[PDB]
Design a binder for this molecule. Structure first.
Ligand SMILES: NC[C@H]1CC[C@H](C(=O)O)CC1
Length: 83
């Protein structure tokens, strides 16, 4: 709902994809479970976090989000390359 295909790292990216490249559907950036992690939307008027859609707060290579797995905290999302 901003940029749906990216040049690579999806800095601004808040498309619609929220699937970790090697795992699961991400757990939203809010507070739910498995854990009340950092990067909480309540502290950002910035157009960063959203529901579970991958972002890049530390601007990692591939945009990531927290997973739904109780042991896998963060994970890189596979977001579609603009081709
Ligand atoms: N290593 C990239 C980036 C991944 C998430 C991590 C966190 O969960 O805080 C911050 C660093």
């Amino acid at each position: 709902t901003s940029e749906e295909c990216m040049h690579g790292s999806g800095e601004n990216y808040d498309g619609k994809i929220s699937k970790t490249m090697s795992g699961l559907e991400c757990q939203a950036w809010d507070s739910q479970s498995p854990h009340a992690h950092g990067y909480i939307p309540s502290k950002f008027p910035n157009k960063n976090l959203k529901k579970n859609y991958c972002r890049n707060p530390d601007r990692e290579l591939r945009p990531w989000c927290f997973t739904t797995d109780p042991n896998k905290r963060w994970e890189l999302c596979d977001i579609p390359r603009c081709t």
